[PDB]
Amino acid sequence: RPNHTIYINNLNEKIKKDELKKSLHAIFSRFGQILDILVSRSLKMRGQAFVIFKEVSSATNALRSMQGFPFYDKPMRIQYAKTDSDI
RNA sequence: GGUCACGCACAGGGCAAACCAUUCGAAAGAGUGGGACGCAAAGCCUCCGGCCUAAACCAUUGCACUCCGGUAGGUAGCGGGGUUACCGAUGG
Ligand SMILES: [Mg+2]
């Protein structure tokens, strides 16, 4: 079930792609080193985020420690990634 | 000569990329002035495709690692297509 990547859900879609990544990096980096943050604003990708960690353990902490956390007046919905491409 | 093509020139020369200044714009970008990388339609039109922007509105709770909702705006110097047009290689 666990994964290097965490699937953040229910995000404010009004945030600019640049700020969104930036803020997510500014909030999740305290859990572990981040490879890259995948954010896209297409109809299929809106309000969603993929945060890829070096270590699954750091992804595990980030999920458990910050599930529900209000972010741009909206509660984050963190769950594990189903499948993970890249490293 | 007219027309339909064509560009190896000729003559008048035309336009003006990047960058800078300034204006408008949420932005992409455009206007104007300076400036020239190039352009035989780099004149003009967003009909078809591509690409860029996403402030408002509409819709979307969506598992990606080609890239993508509508609506709107932009690019005609991204192609196609439409339309107009100067010169005329003893030119075809
Ligand atoms: Mg011609």
Nearest nucleotide over every DNA/RNA strand to the A44 CA, judged by C1': B62
Helix (H) or strand (E) holding A84: none
Phi, psi angles (nearest 5°) of residue A60: -65, -45
Q: How was this structure determined?
A: X-ray
Q: Which domains does chain A have, with CATH numbers?
A: 1-87 (3.30.70.330)
Specified resolution (Å): 2.8
Helix, strand or coil, per DSSP, at residue A86: coil
Nearest nucleotide over every DNA/RNA strand to the A80 CA, judged by C1': B63
Angle at which helices A56-66 and A17-28 pack, to 10 degrees?
Answer: 100
| Strand order, beta sheet including A77-80 | A34-38, A49-53, A5-9, A77-80
A52-78 burial code (b ≥16 CB/10 A, e <16): bbeeeebbbebbeebeeeebeeeebeb
| HSE value, Cβ hemisphere, 13 Å, CA-based, for A49 | 28
Q: How far is the CA of A29 from the C1' of B19 (A)?
A: 39
Query: Do residues A75 and A66 lie in contact, with contact meaning Cβ atoms separated by under 8 Å?
Result: no
Query: Do residues A82 and A6 lie in contact, with contact meaning Cβ atoms separated by under 8 Å?
Result: no
